[PDB]
Amino acid sequence: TRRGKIVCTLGPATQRDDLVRALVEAGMDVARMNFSHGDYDDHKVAYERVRVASDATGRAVGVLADLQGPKIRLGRFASGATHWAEGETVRITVGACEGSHDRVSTTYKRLAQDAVAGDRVLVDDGKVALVVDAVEGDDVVCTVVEGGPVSDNKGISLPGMNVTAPALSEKDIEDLTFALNLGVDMVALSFVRSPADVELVHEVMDRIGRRVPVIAKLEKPEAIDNLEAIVLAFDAVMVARGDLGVELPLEEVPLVQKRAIQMARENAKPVIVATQMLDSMIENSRPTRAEASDVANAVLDGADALMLSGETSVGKYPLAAVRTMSRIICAVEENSTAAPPLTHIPRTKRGVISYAARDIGERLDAKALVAFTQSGDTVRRLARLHTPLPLLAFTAWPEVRSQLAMTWGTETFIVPKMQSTDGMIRQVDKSLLELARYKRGDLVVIVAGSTNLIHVHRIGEDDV
Amino acid sequence: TRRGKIVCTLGPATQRDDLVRALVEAGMDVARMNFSHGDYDDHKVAYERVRVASDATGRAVGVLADLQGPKIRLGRFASGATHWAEGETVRITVGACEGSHDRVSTTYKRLAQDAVAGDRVLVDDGKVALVVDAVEGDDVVCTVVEGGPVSDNKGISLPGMNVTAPALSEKDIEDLTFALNLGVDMVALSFVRSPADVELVHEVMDRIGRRVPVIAKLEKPEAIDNLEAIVLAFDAVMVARGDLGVELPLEEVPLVQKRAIQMARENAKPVIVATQMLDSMIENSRPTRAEASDVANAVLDGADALMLSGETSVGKYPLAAVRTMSRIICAVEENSTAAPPLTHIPRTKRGVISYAARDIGERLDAKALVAFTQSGDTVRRLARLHTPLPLLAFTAWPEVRSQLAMTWGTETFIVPKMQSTDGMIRQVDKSLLELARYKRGDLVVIVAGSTNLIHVHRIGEDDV
Amino acid sequence: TRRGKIVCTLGPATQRDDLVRALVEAGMDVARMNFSHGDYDDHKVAYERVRVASDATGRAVGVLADLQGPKIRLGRFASGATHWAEGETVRITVGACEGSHDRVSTTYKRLAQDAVAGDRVLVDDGKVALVVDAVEGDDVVCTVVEGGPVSDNKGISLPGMNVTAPALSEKDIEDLTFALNLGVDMVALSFVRSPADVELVHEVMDRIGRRVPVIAKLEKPEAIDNLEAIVLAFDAVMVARGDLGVELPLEEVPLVQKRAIQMARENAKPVIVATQMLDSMIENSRPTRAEASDVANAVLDGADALMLSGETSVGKYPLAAVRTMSRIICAVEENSTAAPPLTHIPRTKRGVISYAARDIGERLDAKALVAFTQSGDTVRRLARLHTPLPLLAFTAWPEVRSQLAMTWGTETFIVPKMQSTDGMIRQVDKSLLELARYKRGDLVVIVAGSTNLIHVHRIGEDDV
Amino acid sequence: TRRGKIVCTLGPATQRDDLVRALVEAGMDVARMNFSHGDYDDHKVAYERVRVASDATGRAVGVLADLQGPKIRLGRFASGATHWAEGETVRITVGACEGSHDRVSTTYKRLAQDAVAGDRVLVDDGKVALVVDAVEGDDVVCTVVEGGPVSDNKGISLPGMNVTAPALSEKDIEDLTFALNLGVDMVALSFVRSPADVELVHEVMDRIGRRVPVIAKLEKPEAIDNLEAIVLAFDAVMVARGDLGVELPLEEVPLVQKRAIQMARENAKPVIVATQMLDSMIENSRPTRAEASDVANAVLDGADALMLSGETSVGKYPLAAVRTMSRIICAVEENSTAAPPLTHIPRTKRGVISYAARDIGERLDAKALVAFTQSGDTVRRLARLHTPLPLLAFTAWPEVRSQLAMTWGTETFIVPKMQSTDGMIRQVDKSLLELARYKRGDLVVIVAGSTNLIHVHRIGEDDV
Ligand SMILES: O=C([O-])C(=O)[O-]
Ligand SMILES: O=C([O-])C(=O)[O-]
Ligand SMILES: O=C([O-])C(=O)[O-]
Ligand SMILES: O=C([O-])C(=O)[O-]
Ligand SMILES: [Mg+2]
Ligand SMILES: [Mg+2]
Ligand SMILES: [Mg+2]
Ligand SMILES: [Mg+2]
């Protein structure tokens, strides 16, 4: 069964009765609540349906809160929605107004003072393109160059233009607080630009008295220039290909994706690949050949997890998308679970032991390898190795089971806190014997202790 | 500049004035004439516009004739086109009729006698799905399971069901003949199943007194079981992902693609990857993140050439598709031109010398590798190696320049037939000096003779 | 300090007062008692002086009993000693006589019935050579071809001629018994030919009620044809180059030596290299350049131990030989301790863990590897790896300390039978702390249990 | 047949009738004339017997002139020869005298002013050892520590003490001149210390109007510190182990030997290994096991050539020594001709092509590699690769055939100068066809031109 994890985004299409349960049963490992849409009641209902489904099926399911970030968007139109056609002049002003088809506002108040002539403006991730003709006082005058649809509050991106905006907006902080009190397991931050951005998130968490892992979404050039620093300061990364393919040339995105996955893996941080993987399944029951290829290739790149966005949140086939994503992942993994070799050589006790434990397990045909861990850190160092052996984490903290839900190839077990190696072994055999694929005699390799011990153990027997 | 080749499909969208010229100027290396659509006049006009554009720009452009093969299609509907909806019963009969919405004919006359209850029927490569309920006399009764649109003569696929049909239909043979007299450079055959299929194509060519390279399109399970035999009997392969993803589970297609490219490269046969690479650009000016990824990944897989089908043949952005495909290819190649290592070890004189010539060229920082060749065979053995050095073929046969247009990384030069090594060197220096990248002093490596010589030569200097 | 072990042979030159002690202090790791010379009183005195010296210095010293085997030798001469000169005819008869210079007896009673015309006869390992002219009744008539000295009972070898003789003679069995009662640690058997030879030694040991490790000396062609079988049935091997270079062409001996060392190492059996390593030091205070090279090369080949024979047993510089041998070994090891890579890949629990333990130790810069073992088996699997880390064996059996004295790189510690992992760790820290260069904080890797545990431990600290 | 070359030293034992011829027929590839012994008439007679034997057998035989260098030696004794015994005081004075047993002169006039108390004095390469007690005025007072024999003019070495002496003495220059006029092919210089030493030899050669290759003998610490510089400035190196093992600790010599051979091979310079390889064959018809091992190990180290000194020059078995040396070399090579991998990567045209030519030859099972060369430079770059293919040099200069006689694996052919590639090929086929084991159809690889061409050619056939 499947090693690569699947992240699904909740929204309108999953609000109907017991669709969230259906997703979990179909293989969803992490549920993303997108704070760009919906109200707090919406998020709250969805959060609870996930907890119920996780508890009712016994599948681990993380809840991931995605903060909107400093997203730049259009203001409001008189008609609600207009149409921008190849040829037209359009004004985007920092001054407030109830925008009309030719004139409209933005949330970015430094637009006029930061846009220059020749700047490109991409709307809704490249559905409509404009070029800046002039900055007159408080207005940015533009000519539509590729036409299409514009609603209220749709997102625009100005490639190249250096944006000045705080990493967390007022909305974000409110939304972060709400999510932390609600009890989410992880937080993603959009439009991350430097390593210092995590410290702002950390300040808010410390104020409220609760921390969780923070995921940096990579969708900005500055993020890619500081990729290593970012992967080190944050707990995980999401390759956010939607905005990444408008903030950067779309032709560069495929190599950036591979570079980020490798960088994450070398540092034992989870990496998620997002956006448009099975885009066409928003309308169609089967994906395109490129979409199947894209998912297969993200698995071979070595991604911990792949994400569905519109495919589950607003589309007509949320369940089939998840099922289809899962089949592709499985088809690839059945053939081989091999990932790109890592170039870094373990110098840390935990790392060194993890390599060794894999070697032993693989050479001895072990049925599984088992790690005890507090924060998951030892398990993540084993996960990046991409062994075909079942990787089984044992922990006392139950929130850690939810956090490891987005780590490659890993199932987690909650157990009471232990005070002897004898304890650990009895514990393991007990926990594992309750599954049908584990019988007395099965050979496993156990890593334990702050980790400093490898133990080759046959289930049931007294080898300790 | 670009090493990977681009194949474009001509049709309605490229018939407008000087669009074919525009494609060639945008980088089209091979033009595919799809005999599933259009009349002989259409093909003839398009063929001539390609010859003109190739001659007027000086870019090599192959013309590839795609034979329809034993495609199974629906017959004709009374109303021309109906709608098949999730729930309905539908009959597909081998008897002739002017089919109505509930009842319709097929071209496959063994349908009733070969279809069985529970058989799936996929229409138009998975836009509509049906399941066989009963075979009553001459009719195949079906229940629509995923609904959508059905026109006249649309293609259906029955996964699993063993088809009995000759590799070349009467239509194919006529179309092959017409194309050979018209003067195409290559021929692709659809729905290839065994190595013996090429012998049928060869019989027709011999009758007419003209041969060209034959490309096996891989879109059938039997083709994949005989992959090695097929790659050896045919001159090239196209991974035809459209039908391949309905004849086989779509989740398996990505690994089949990689396996075929590797198999082609090990045998120095060109491989093309086809269908849905930038599918969304039929309607949109920019592709999806999955589509960009799919193209990038086919280049890294090691494909000689990538193909556009509907993106150029019927869509709204044929030029942009080609330009976009080219940018992605270039973005990938700029980073690296490295392909998957080959596992076979050269035992053939020409092969062994090709490896050696690459080694020399790379270690000496040579500006280019130059091969003389009759059929292109030595050049193809060098092309599969994927060196970053310009690969330059020299030949007397002008049709060979068109055939090498779909071989990785390769530019070809026509020269008069030569009868001394002194001649070859003067020839090379002359041909190469007429370009801007080549100046006196530039170091190149020349392979020559049936090939048995390597010559390290500085342009201009007397070192023969 | 030194990793490669040194075996010394005791005899007349080491019988003077406290020379045995001097050898032990100079680095002798194993003392060989050669039963081809001396009486039981001699062996007994020497054995006791070794036990005393081992106990008084605290250096481990094994005692190795070398059984003469089916050595073929001349009988007795009237004059005691004669001279065989290039040109002369000589008879070697199976009948008893008090041989003169023209006529003399042999111990081999099948000589006449097994020698044929043209057979070569080498005396004293190639000091004198003869050729067989005729077999007349009970005599083998020979022509001296290379002249030199012949005393009574000197050893002859007939290259090629198939010898029929029991692996253990009556003398051997008596000598084996005497040695087993005396309390030697190992036994070497000369002229081994098949794997079944060890079973004969085992029968004698079982009768007497005491087993020790048996070393096969390799000095026969049949031994080299069955090298793998022999290395598996015996506990160790000695490349006995003296007789090996007359039983085989001397030019083949160097590759046979390397092949045997590799074969031993692949199976974690100790290998000793013997005879003429510093031959000239029998007369001279310094060796030849070839001799220094030969010792250096045996270390690089990967030999557990090198042996001195005449250099210590009869020569004028027994102490200097040992000191000189030690300096060369150390000079080589200081540069590097790297041996030829092993080709076999660990499939056994013990083996797999040993590799892993080395990896951990090396990558973590551990001060030492520590193995607990019953028979030494786990330690030998680590020793063949040739790590630069100190390798420290812990055992309850004191005879095992003597047996491991001929295993590469290994020091042994006697300890009471600990009965808990807590025990083992306290035990290790205690034992190791009693030396300088082991201090609190030093990092070591411990292998333990039938072995199934690796434990990375800092000396002193509580991390069990 | 044999790839490794053999150097023999001529002297008293080879002066008897037709022994030089016998050596050449036994496989001598280079004859060393040692100018430390004999008069000019002696050298002259020996030189001519070598030319005759080389011409009469058709075997290439180089003549190598070994210059004594700044050898420090004792003066003359009243009794001619005395005996220095463990215990005695001995004076070695820079003042002239007809030394007696207690008092004697040296050639080194800076002895008293450069020797200090505690200095070791080794005589005749370690046969007698002394320690300096005092420097009184013009005398160096010594205590014998290891006793033995002292003749007139025997060589002493003072390890550590920095010697000041010109690289060429007056005797050397005379001897160099005489040898150059006599027509030797190579020159070796003893006690080389820096790269600048070759420039002094070059000055003398230029004065006299004739150059030959110069071999640096390595027998000094300063030589080993400047090993790379020396290997680059000189044309070849000899590991002169006799003095090297007294100027340096003898235990270090074996690794210095391997380091020098590797350094030579990386720079395509021939390396010779000298002194005491079969030392015992001065008195005995068969060597020791260490001696056989030493020769085998020098071949595996990758030495171009091994040298005999006293074994042929003064001993009782000059012919057998050469035969025995040859058998060992062949025994090793039959198994494999593989040498230690080289770490440098070819960046020079000639080097790069040599690698390539080997690759082609080996992969195509070519019967031979053929190189054309002026100075031998291309051939030496191929020789260091140690391919199992016959390596055949073609040159117009006949002295080059003599110089290549000490280069691994290489036979040379003299041919008239050619002025077309057609010429070269006809030339090769002609030259090679005159041997059995070259027949029409045999495949060879030819390197040619200043080298810039590889040509895979079947003997006889027209494929130019
Ligand atoms: O936010 C995202 O996931 C994106 O932009 O692709
Ligand atoms: O024919 C094709 O290109 C296909 O089916 O994908
Ligand atoms: O017995 C031995 O050791 C030998 O023959 O070398
Ligand atoms: O000069 C030599 O040959 C030596 O010293 O070994
Ligand atoms: Mg985004
Ligand atoms: Mg098709
Ligand atoms: Mg023996
Ligand atoms: Mg010397």
Whether C330 and chain D come into contact, CB under 8 Å, resolves to: yes
Q: Helix (H) and strand (E) counts for chain D?
A: 16, 21
Q: Do chains D and C touch (3 or more CB pairs under 8 A)?
A: yes
The minimal CB distance from A255 to the residues B242, B252, B332 is found for B332
Chain B residue at shortest CA distance from A287: B250
Distance from CA of C295 to the nearest CA of D (A): 8
Residues D271 and D231: their CA atoms lie apart, in Å, by 9
Listed resolution, Å: 2.6
Tokens read off for A224 = 């890619």
On whether the CB atoms of residues A371 and A394 are closer than 8 A, the answer is yes
The DSSP output letter for A12 is: G
CATH architecture of B2-69+167-332: Alpha-Beta Barrel (3.20)
The DSSP output letter for B327 is: H
- Say yes or no: CB of residue D217 within 6 Å of ligand 4: yes
Note whether C290 contacts D293, CB cutoff 8 Å. yes
Q: Closest Cα partner for A61 from A71, A72, A46? A: A46
Q: At what angle do helices C289-301 and C318-335 cross, to 10 degrees?
A: 50
| H or E element at residue B223 | helix B221-225
Residues A394 and A372: their CA atoms lie apart, in Å, by 5
| Residue B275 bears catalytic tag | yes
| C-alpha atoms less than 13 angstroms from C-alpha of A352 in its C-beta half-sphere | 22
What spacing in Å lies between the alpha carbon of D237 and ligand 8's midpoint?
A: 13
Note whether D255 contacts C332, CB cutoff 8 Å. yes
What spacing in Å lies between the alpha carbon of A181 and ligand 1's midpoint?
A: 25
Contacts of A63 (CB under 8 A, 6+ apart): A30, A31, A33, A47, A50, A51, A183, A184, A185, A186, A402
Question: What is the radius of gyration, based on Cα positions, of chain A?
Answer: 24
| Residue D258 bears catalytic tag | no
Largest CA distance in chain D: 82
Place of tokens 């861990």: A373
Ligand nearest to the CA of D125: 4
- Say yes or no: CB of residue C240 within 6 Å of ligand 3: yes
Residues with CB under 5 A from ligand 7 (ion): C 219, 240, 243
On whether the CB atoms of residues C23 and C49 are closer than 8 A, the answer is no
Residues C302 and C385: their CA atoms lie apart, in Å, by 9
The DSSP output letter for B162 is: P
Picking from D252, D293, D334 by the largest number of C CB atoms within 10 A of its own CB, the best residue to mutate is D293
Note whether A453 contacts C452, CB cutoff 8 Å. no
What spacing in Å lies between the alpha carbon of B126 and ligand 1's midpoint?
A: 29
Q: Specify the 3-state DSSP secondary structure of C221.
A: helix
Q: Is C107 annotated as a binding residue?
A: no
Query: Which is it for strands C148-151 and C81-84: parallel, antiparallel or unpaired?
Result: antiparallel
Name the phi and psi angles at A205, rounded to 5: -65, -40
Tokens read off for D60 = 């290439």
- Say yes or no: CB of residue A223 within 6 Å of ligand 1: no
Note whether C353 contacts A456, CB cutoff 8 Å. yes
Name the phi and psi angles at D453, rounded to 5: -155, 135
Q: Is C77 annotated as a binding residue?
A: no
Q: Closest Cα partner for C361 from C351, C353, C372, C350? A: C353
Whether C456 and chain A come into contact, CB under 8 Å, resolves to: yes
Torsion of CA C202, C206, C210, C211, to 10 degrees: 20
User: Which residues of C are annotated as catalytic?
Assistant: 32, 73, 217, 275
Picking from B344, B345, B347, B352 by the largest number of D CB atoms within 10 A of its own CB, the best residue to mutate is B352
Strand spans (E) along C419-464: 443-448, 453-458
Q: Chains meeting D at 3+ CB pairs closer than 8 A?
A: B, C
- Say yes or no: CB of residue B274 within 6 Å of ligand 2: yes
Note whether C360 contacts A359, CB cutoff 8 Å. no
Note whether C290 contacts D294, CB cutoff 8 Å. yes
Residue C354, amino acid: S
Note whether A454 contacts C453, CB cutoff 8 Å. yes
Which residues in chain C touch residue A454, judged by CB atoms under 8 angstroms apart?
A: 356, 453-455
Distance from CA of C423 to the nearest CA of A (A): 13
Distance of CA B81 to the CA centre of its chain: 31
| H or E element at residue A237 | strand A236-240
Query: What is the number of the ligand 2 atom nearest to the C-alpha of B190?
Result: 1
Residues that constitute the known binding site of B for ATP: 34-37, 73, 154
Residues that constitute the known binding site of D: 32, 34-37, 66, 73, 154, 219, 242-243, 275
Whether A359 and chain C come into contact, CB under 8 Å, resolves to: yes
- Say yes or no: CB of residue A274 within 6 Å of ligand 1: yes
Q: Closest Cα partner for A349 from D308, D441, C456? A: C456
Which residues in chain A touch residue B241, judged by CB atoms under 8 angstroms apart?
A: 289
How many residue pairs from chains C and D have C-beta atoms closer than 8 A? 131
Query: What is the number of the ligand 3 atom nearest to the C-alpha of C242?
Result: 6
Tokens read off for D330 = 């062949």
The minimal CB distance from B452 to the residues D352, D356, D456 is found for D456
Residue with CA nearest ligand 4 atom 1: D240
Q: Three-state SS string across C76-118, please?
A: CECCCEEEECCCCEEEEECCCCCECCCEEEECCCCHHHHCCCC
Sign of the torsion angle spanned by Cα atoms A259, A263, A268, A274: negative
Which residues in chain B touch residue D452, judged by CB atoms under 8 angstroms apart?
A: 455-457, 463
Residues C36 and C310: their CA atoms lie apart, in Å, by 13
Q: Do chains A and D touch (3 or more CB pairs under 8 A)?
A: no
Note whether A290 contacts B285, CB cutoff 8 Å. no
CATH 3.20.20.60 in chain C, residues?
2-69+167-332
Q: Chains meeting C at 3+ CB pairs closer than 8 A?
A: A, D
Whether B456 and chain D come into contact, CB under 8 Å, resolves to: yes
Quickly list DSSP for B255-269.
Answer: HHHHHHHHHHHHTT-
Quickly list DSSP for A328-385.
Answer: HHHHHHHH----PPP-----SHHHHHHHHHHHHHHHTT-SEEEEE-SSSHHHHHHHTT
Contacts of A278 (CB under 8 A, 6+ apart): A287, A291, A295, A308, A311, A321, A324, A325, B290
Task: Give the number of other CB atoms < 10 A from CB of residue C96.
Answer: 11
Distance of CA A143 to the CA centre of its chain: 36
Note whether A293 contacts B127, CB cutoff 8 Å. no
Chain B residue at shortest CA distance from D463: B449
Q: Closest Cα partner for D70 from D285, D212, D222, D264? A: D222
Q: Closest Cα partner for D428 from D418, C309, D437, C74? A: D418
- Scanning C260-299 for CB atoms below 8 A from D yields 275-280, 284-298
Q: Three-state SS string across A38-88, please?
A: CCHHHHHHHHHHHHHHHHHHCCCCEEEEEECCCCCEECCECCCCEEECCCC
Query: Bridge-partner residues for D391, per DSSP?
Result: D369, D410
Method used for this model? Answer: X-ray
Residues B299 and A255: their CA atoms lie apart, in Å, by 12
The minimal CB distance from D277 to the residues C252, C285, C290 is found for C290
- Say yes or no: CB of residue B242 within 6 Å of ligand 2: yes
Quickly list DSSP for D419-456.
Answer: -SHHHHHHHHHHHHHTSTT--TT-EEEEEE----EEEE
Note whether A359 contacts C356, CB cutoff 8 Å. yes
* C-alpha triplet C274, C276, C279: angle, nearest 5°: 145
What spacing in Å lies between the alpha carbon of B176 and ligand 2's midpoint?
A: 18
